[PDB]
Every structure is written in C-alpha cells, then in structure tokens.
Design a protein around this ligand. Structure first.
Ligand code: WGV
Length: 284
C-alpha cells in the first residue's frame, strides 16, 4: 500500500505530519487531524488546500484527496468551516478553544473587521486565557504583547488590552474563551465567507455566505440580505452563479439574481459553499 505524506497547518500555527494511503478520501486525513487535536465536535471544521490558481478550496471529505490537490503539494490547513451562531451551545470547551484560535486569525488577517474597543476586549480575553491573571512584573508602561491582536498594532491598542486584562482577575481559560466568543459572534462579518463577483450590470460586488443566509455587499450602503428561507435554489453555469428568491406571498413567480464570477472554478466553489451552508441552516 503506497502512502503520501500530508502536512497540516494547525490553528496554533504548528505543523502536523502524517501519512495516508494515496487513494484516501479527505475524511481519512481529517479524522487523523481531529484525533491529534482531541476534537469530537468535528462537524464545524474542515481542511483547506491551495489550488493551481492559488485559491483556498475546502477538501471534500467524500472525494479522493489526489483528485482535489491534483498537481499540487499535499499541504493543508485546519480551519473552521461552519461558524456556530451561538458558540455557548457547543458541548466542549476544546471546540470553543479552536473556534477562538480561528477567530484570532480572522481578526489579525482583517477578514473580520473590528472596532478599536472590540479589538482590545477580544485581545484582553485572549491574554487572560493564555497568561492568566494580570501581572505588573511582565508589563511596564512600555509593554508590547507577543500576541497579535489586530491587522495593525498601535501602542494605544496594547495599553487598552492591558487596562481590560486588569479587570479579568480570577477568570479561567474556558471563561475568558466564552467571553471572547460572546463578543466575536456579534460582529457583522462573523462567520461570513466573502466571494468577489459582478452583478448582472457588470458592477463589482461581494457575496457573503454565512449561517443566516446570503449577503450582497453593493457597498457600505445597499447591503441586500436573503435569509435561507427566502433562497429557493442556487446554481452555476460557466462563469455564472444564479440565486432564485421566493416571491412575496401572493406573488406568482420567484425572482432570479445573476452574478458573474472570475472563472468557472470560482462559480462552482461559491455554489458548493452555499449548498453546504444551506444544509447547515436546515439542521439548526
Ligand atoms: C449575517 C447575516 C444575514 C442576516 C439575515 C439574512 C441574511 C444574512 C451575518 N451575521 C453575523 C453576526 C451574527 C448574525 C449573522
């Protein structure tokens, strides 16, 4: 039996290495990573790889790894796939812990925009979880944390983290992680997967996919939101992605909103993440 070496970037930035038989389905590797992580609530998570076009793709657990990575390296990342709208309802603290690590990266990367005060509050809960109670000894007026808190660090933000960290004395890691998630879950881009597209008139928009439904970001004004109940069906053809929307009750016919994606692959990728998120919605 011939086995391929797999390298997986974990949410703490460490690398897990294992082998799978070369015709292995994605689930085989995913099970090995989750066992390494002591993770039972596996449904929220997945592995990504980078394609020949360098786009992040989800590794489909039901398909051969080799028919997805194709010409590319067997290099993957471990990631949150379905962000729980209410993380307090997860059964295990360790689930919440990996969700916090993912969200920290969402924040530092700028995928999850955040006010100054929310960056400092989230950062203060991370410090409480990682270092425990505030200690003046490892913190003068000139202190800068090793922790990455934001896409752009300022001394003002470092000071605000320390100020809020002082208020969390006696908080356990599980408690701090739960506070982190109660704040993060409210942010308007929490759990939103963004895709570049053009509307039917050729104007550049972003489509967001999340637990609640689909968002069309025309700009900061003119955000269109379709709760999953309103979304009839979703399809792709060539470079095109089509959303059918239920009529208002007493209306005869659904509406169709069409979008142009960069290429056929970007259209199929959006379709798949939409179908996967809708099935998530129906199981809540
Ligand atoms: C959204 C949405 C949405 C809301 C209504 C219809 C379609 C999409 C994103 N938001 C993140 C914070 C928690 C609530 C869900």
């Amino acid at each position: 039996p011939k086995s391929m070496q797999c390298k997986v970037i974990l949410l703490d930035g460490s690398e897990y290495t294992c082998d799978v038989e070369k015709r292995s389905r994605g689930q085989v590797l995913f099970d090995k990573v989750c066992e390494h992580l002591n993770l039972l609530e596996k449904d929220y998570f997945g592995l990504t790889y980078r394609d020949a076009e360098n786009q992040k793709n989800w590794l489909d657990p039901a398909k051969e790894i080799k028919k997805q990575v194709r010409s590319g390296a067997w290099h993957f990342s471990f990631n949150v796939k379905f962000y729980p709208p209410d993380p307090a309802q997860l059964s295990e603290d360790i689930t919440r812990y990996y969700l916090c690590l993912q969200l920290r990266d969402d924040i530092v990367s700028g995928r999850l925009p955040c006010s100054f005060v929310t960056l400092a509050l989230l950062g203060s809960y991370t410090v409480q979880s990682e270092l425990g109670d505030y200690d003046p000894d490892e913190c003068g007026s000139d202190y800068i944390s090793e922790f990455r808190f934001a896409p752009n660090h300022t001394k003002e933000l470092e000071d605000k983290v320390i100020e809020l960290h002082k208020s969390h004395r006696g908080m356990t890691p599980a408690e701090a992680e739960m506070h982190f998630l109660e704040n993060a879950k409210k942010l308007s881009m929490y759990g939103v997967d963004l895709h570049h597209a053009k509307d039917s008139e050729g104007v550049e928009i972003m489509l967001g996919v999340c637990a609640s439904g689909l968002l069309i970001y025309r700009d900061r004004l003119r955000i269109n939101r379709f709760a999953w109940p309103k979304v009839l069906k979703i399809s792709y053809k060539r470079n095109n992605f089509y959303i059918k929307i239920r009529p208002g009750e007493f209306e005869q016919f659904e509406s169709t909103i069409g979008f142009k994606l960069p290429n056929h692959r970007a259209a199929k990728r959006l379709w798949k993440v939409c179908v996967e998120h809708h099935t998530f919605f129906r199981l809540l």
